[PDB]
Structures are given as C-alpha cells and as structure tokens.
Design a protein around this motif. Structure first.
Motif, PDB file in Angstrom:
ATOM      1  N   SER A   1      16.796   4.947   1.781  1.00  0.00           N
ATOM      2  CA  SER A   1      18.017   4.780   0.992  1.00  0.00           C
ATOM      3  C   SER A   1      19.182   4.318   1.870  1.00  0.00           C
ATOM      4  N   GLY A   2      19.935   3.338   1.367  1.00  0.00           N
ATOM      5  CA  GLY A   2      21.083   2.805   2.097  1.00  0.00           C
ATOM      6  C   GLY A   2      22.373   3.459   1.615  1.00  0.00           C
ATOM      7  N   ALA A   3      23.518   2.799   1.870  1.00  0.00           N
ATOM      8  CA  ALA A   3      24.765   3.384   1.435  1.00  0.00           C
ATOM      9  C   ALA A   3      24.835   3.256  -0.040  1.00  0.00           C
ATOM     10  N   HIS A   4      24.248   4.227  -0.655  1.00  0.00           N
ATOM     11  CA  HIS A   4      24.270   4.333  -2.060  1.00  0.00           C
ATOM     12  C   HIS A   4      25.714   4.654  -2.426  1.00  0.00           C
ATOM     13  N   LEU A   5      26.439   5.148  -1.410  1.00  0.00           N
ATOM     14  CA  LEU A   5      27.834   5.505  -1.525  1.00  0.00           C
ATOM     15  C   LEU A   5      28.753   4.316  -1.320  1.00  0.00           C
ATOM     16  N   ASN A   6      28.221   3.107  -1.069  1.00  0.00           N
ATOM     17  CA  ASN A   6      29.108   1.943  -0.841  1.00  0.00           C
ATOM     18  C   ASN A   6      28.875   0.787  -1.839  1.00  0.00           C
TER      19      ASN A   6
ATOM     20  N   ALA B   1      29.247   3.623 -11.023  1.00  0.00           N
ATOM     21  CA  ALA B   1      29.003   5.014 -10.660  1.00  0.00           C
ATOM     22  C   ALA B   1      29.668   5.385  -9.339  1.00  0.00           C
ATOM     23  N   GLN B   2      29.510   4.550  -8.316  1.00  0.00           N
ATOM     24  CA  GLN B   2      30.113   4.805  -6.995  1.00  0.00           C
ATOM     25  C   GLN B   2      31.603   4.629  -7.001  1.00  0.00           C
ATOM     26  N   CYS B   3      32.071   3.662  -7.771  1.00  0.00           N
ATOM     27  CA  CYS B   3      33.490   3.433  -7.837  1.00  0.00           C
ATOM     28  C   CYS B   3      34.054   4.740  -8.296  1.00  0.00           C
ATOM     29  N   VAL B   4      33.298   5.380  -9.166  1.00  0.00           N
ATOM     30  CA  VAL B   4      33.644   6.679  -9.638  1.00  0.00           C
ATOM     31  C   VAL B   4      33.441   7.722  -8.531  1.00  0.00           C
TER      32      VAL B   4
ATOM     33  N   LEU C   1      27.799  10.407  -6.696  1.00  0.00           N
ATOM     34  CA  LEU C   1      27.555  11.543  -5.872  1.00  0.00           C
ATOM     35  C   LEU C   1      27.743  11.148  -4.416  1.00  0.00           C
ATOM     36  N   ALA C   2      27.295   9.946  -4.152  1.00  0.00           N
ATOM     37  CA  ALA C   2      27.285   9.344  -2.839  1.00  0.00           C
ATOM     38  C   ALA C   2      28.657   9.077  -2.250  1.00  0.00           C
ATOM     39  N   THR C   3      29.512   8.502  -3.063  1.00  0.00           N
ATOM     40  CA  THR C   3      30.845   8.140  -2.628  1.00  0.00           C
ATOM     41  C   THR C   3      31.753   9.364  -2.527  1.00  0.00           C
ATOM     42  N   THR C   4      31.544  10.373  -3.356  1.00  0.00           N
ATOM     43  CA  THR C   4      32.404  11.550  -3.295  1.00  0.00           C
ATOM     44  C   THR C   4      32.139  12.348  -2.018  1.00  0.00           C
TER      45      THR C   4
END
Length: 292
Positions: free
Chosen positions: A71-76, A100-103, A19-22
């Motif tokens: 929360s940190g870069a849950h997207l990284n 999950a994030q790679c996704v 969710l984070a990376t998208t």
C-alpha cells in the motif's frame, strides 16, 4: 422503509483513505506546533523544516506499514493523481479515493483545533506563508517537489529491475518527507493538495488556495509522461509472446530433458481417501524413524 445503515460505504478501503490522511496530517501538525512551541527564543533548541517535514514522510510509511508494503500513500491525493494515468469514463473508485482523503486531512485539522484552545494558532501550518515563495510561487516549487512524489510510486509498482534497496514504501517516503522539505516550507503549501486543504478549510482565500491544487497535479501528471511508454490497454496476449530464441520450451522451461528417468508419471492415487493399509513389503531395513 427501514433506515438504519445509510450509505454503507462502497469498500473497506474507501474508509482506509480518509483514515489515511487524518492519521498523518493530524499529527503532522503536531510537529509544526512544537517547532513554534515554545515560541520565541527561550532555549538553544531550534526546529527547522527538515524536522517536521522529515516527520511527515515517515508517517506515510506506517500508513503503508499498518496495512502492508503493498500500500502506498493512501493518505495522499497528489500521488493518487498519477495513478489515474488516463482512465475516467463515468465515476471510478479513485474518484472515491480522492474525495475520501481530501476528507481525511480536513477532519484531522478540525480535531487539532480544539487542541489549540490553550495555545495560540500562530504557526499551525495553515495559511501561514513562509518567507520566500508566496503561495503562488509554489507553482514551480510544488510541481518539482510533488513530481518527485509520483515518480517514486510508479517505479515502486514497476516489476522491472533497476534501483532497489529495502521496501518501496520506505523508499517512496524518503521521497515524501523530502518533497515536503522543498515544497512545504517555501509556501507552507503542502506537496500534496491534501496538506494545504486540511488547513485550507479553516481559512479560505482567493486564487492563492487554487495554486495548492494545480502545482501537484501538473507535476505528477507530467511524471506520468516522463515514465509511461509502451501502451497495451488490457493484456490480451495474442499467443504467448511474439518471438522465439530457443525452441523446445513453450511456457517457461530452462532445461530440455528427453525423458531419461520417469519419476512421477502415473498419479499413485492423487489425494488420499482412506487406505487403511500400506504396501508394507516388510521392514528389514529400519533406518527411518529413530529420534534416539
């Protein structure tokens, strides 16, 4: 057998992660689209890596904000590499966090492509090498740039006191947009392997694609050694510290009274039950309850 809820996920944040990376990466592309759109010298406005990259670090902040400073870069995934530190026996939540994030970034780019149905993918930040560091060249460039990302996270979670100014998420991010400023443009390869992979699923390559994964892992991993001394697997606490400086206190006392005026010693009742009547003792002195 019944089949309606497959997988059922593992945690409400495994999702938080793709969710984070998208959210960050998908729009991040938007900056790279305008920097090139309108394309060609038509106006006076000019977009530099500083705008788009600066653009990148902030989103991460909200990533942090939509949930809380905790929360940190849950997207990284680049920052997450350092988190591992040295724990990996047989499958772990983080194993789940990295996938999950790679996704997150990959799905993001897929949707953004439709957006390019009208425009032309000339500089979508995907496989678009930048004059300077070829992808490989980002090896050194990725390690320092990314490294900078990891160090901000560890210090952010550090309880010690040395450098504090605002919120850790805002500070670590100052590190992210910047980090992006040096690493991303030099190769176009993300600081993190997630930025490079989202676009990477679109157009595959040779070892050039691998450089994307190693530079961030080397830099962060190294970050760990740089700031991770004093080992203590699981705090067992022998017997409350292992030294004394001032007898009297055992847990955490600043004073050492000697029972002069006992105020609270005998629980008057502890948690009322009903009462139905107070001591009364008459009310000759009516000073309380006034309000004009």
């Amino acid at each position: 057998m019944a089949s309606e809820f497959k997988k059922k996920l593992f945690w409400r944040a495994v999702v938080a992660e793709f969710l984070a990376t998208t959210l960050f990466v998908f729009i991040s592309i938007g900056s790279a689209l305008g920097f090139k759109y309108p394309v060609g010298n038509n106006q006076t406005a000019v977009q530099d890596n500083v705008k788009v990259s600066l653009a990148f670090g902030l989103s991460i902040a909200t990533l942090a904000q939509s949930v809380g400073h905790i929360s940190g870069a849950h997207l990284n995934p680049a920052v997450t590499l350092g988190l591992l530190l040295s724990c990996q026996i047989s499958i772990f939540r983080a194993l789940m966090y990295i996938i999950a994030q790679c996704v997150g970034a990959i799905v993001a780019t897929a949707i953004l492509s439709g957006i390019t149905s009208s425009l032309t993918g000339n500089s979508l930040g995907r496989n678009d090498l930048a004059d300077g560091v070829n992808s490989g060249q980002g090896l050194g460039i990725e390690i320092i740039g990314t490294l900078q990302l990891v160090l901000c996270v560890l210090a952010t979670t550090d309880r010690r006191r040395r450098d504090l100014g605002g919120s850790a998420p805002l500070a670590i991010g100052l590190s992210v947009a910047l980090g992006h400023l040096l690493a991303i443009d030099y190769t176009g390869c993300g600081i993190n392997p997630a930025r490079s992979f989202g676009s990477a699923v679109i157009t595959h390559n040779f070892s050039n694609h691998w450089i994307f994964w190693v530079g961030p892992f080397i830099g962060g991993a190294l970050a760990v050694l740089i700031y991770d001394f004093i080992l203590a697997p699981r705090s067992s606490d022998l017997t409350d510290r292992v030294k004394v400086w001032t007898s009297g206190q055992v847990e955490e006392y600043d004073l050492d009274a000697d029972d002069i005026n006992s105020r609270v010693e005998m629980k008057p009742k502890a948690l009322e039950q009903k009462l139905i009547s107070e001591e009364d003792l008459n009310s000759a002195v009516d000073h309380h309850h006034h309000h004009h």
